[PDB]
């Protein structure tokens, strides 16, 4: 990274549960995949593929669920952020 700049790599820490964890481990140890990350990405590609053809239906459903969620009410930024602070200690 050039000086005065920072890494912008972005990971996530996930709990796969024991059954799927062992599944991932076996795939890496067999040499079929190089890392846990490669296995997880293959899974996410399949999940993205499964729903790729129905994005319009999916968005309609999210919009409809918004429409059906109750009458609209006023928005206040400061009240929202107060409510967020009230949920627990906040830092950074």
């Amino acid at each position: 990274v050039p000086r005065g700049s920072h890494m912008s790599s972005r990971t996530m820490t996930v709990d796969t549960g024991e059954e799927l964890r062992a599944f991932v481990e076996g795939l890496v140890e067999s040499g079929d995949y190089k890392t846990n990350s490669e296995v997880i990405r293959d899974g996410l590609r399949l999940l993205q593929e499964k729903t790729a053809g129905s994005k319009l239906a999916a968005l309609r459903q999210l919009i409809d669920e918004g429409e059906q969620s109750g009458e609209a009410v006023p928005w206040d930024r400061d009240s929202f952020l107060a409510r967020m602070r009230q949920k627990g200690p906040r830092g950074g």
Partner: protein, 95 residues
């Protein structure tokens, strides 16, 4: 003042967006992101010409981008009504 109202589910979207940002980036960035969404909401409530026509999803639906998100809303007599705020990955742009 132009009207600005939000469906309950849109408020819950904002909470989830805030929490997601907070986990990743901390308070200052997450609150700023909400503030930027708020600034966008105010602009859209004032200017009908900004709204992107999203009839192809639902008649009368409008969209507008902010950051990595899209505000989905309807025009009212006096302003806008926000229905959902969704990540841009959920978009279905007009073909």
């Amino acid at each position: 003042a132009n009207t600005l109202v939000l469906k309950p589910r849109a408020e819950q979207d904002l909470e989830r967006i805030f929490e997601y940002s907070y986990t990743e980036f901390g308070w200052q960035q997450a609150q700023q992101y909400i503030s930027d969404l708020d600034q966008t909401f105010q602009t859209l409530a004032a200017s009908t010409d900004l709204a992107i026509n999203y009839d192809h999803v639902r008649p009368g639906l409008k969209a507008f981008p902010v950051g990595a998100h899209i505000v989905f809303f309807r025009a009212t007599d006096t302003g806008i009504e926000v229905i959902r705020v969704l990540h841009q990955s959920m978009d279905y742009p007009r073909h």
